Structure formats: structure tokens, C-alpha cells
Amino acid sequence: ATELVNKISENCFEKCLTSPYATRNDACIDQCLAKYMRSWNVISKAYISRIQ
């Protein structure tokens, strides 16, 4: 449950920030987090509907 944190961080780091990483951008992270958890829900749903 806590490695999860690191994977979201990586994923959202890649999509919201770029070299030389000067400017902090918390609006994008928040969205990316939200978007990430919605993705999780859809995948777990798809996944469970497959293990009949």
C-alpha cells in the first residue's frame, strides 16, 4: 500500500515536470493523482470481472 505512493509519484513526476525542474507545479500533480486513482478503479473492476 506504501510502494504505491512511489509509483504514482514517478508517473506524475514524468507527466507534470521537466528538466531543469525549477518550477513547482502542484495543480498538475493533484489532477494526475485524481486521474491515477480513477484509473485504478477501472482496472480493478475490469480485472475482477475477468476472474468471473
Binding site: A1, D30, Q31, K35, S39, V42
Partner: protein, 58 residues
């Protein structure tokens, strides 16, 4: 296998999220990215079976 549900879901999410979400501008999933997301998981599972069958076939 109540834990192995989490462990796979985490990993699938990680792989599929990269492949289906080309940008974060709203905190919402569009239709196109929602269907890509569920296809991606299913397609992935299909692959696993094909590979494992093929490894014991062969």
C-alpha cells in the same frame, strides 16, 4: 489471494496508465482513455495465458 489482487492491480495500473493517459489537464478520465484502460488490462491477461500455454505446449 486477497493480497495478490492488490499486487497485480498495482502493476497493471502502472503499465496501462502510462500507455493510455497521454496528458493530465483535468482530474477526469475521458471515454476514450477509460476504454483503453480496460482493454489494456484484458489484452494483457490474454497475453499471459497465450504465453503460459505456449510455454507448456512447445
Amino acid at each position: 489471494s486477497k493480497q495478490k489482487v492488490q499486487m497485480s492491480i498495482h502493476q497493471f495500473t502502472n503499465i496501462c496508465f502510462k500507455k493510455c493517459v497521454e496528458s493530465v489537464n483535468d482530474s477526469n478520465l475521458s471515454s476514450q482513455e477509460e476504454q483503453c484502460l480496460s482493454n489494456c488490462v484484458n489484452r494483457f491477461l490474454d497475453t499471459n495465458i497465450r504465453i503460459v500455454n505456449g510455454l507448456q505446449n512447445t
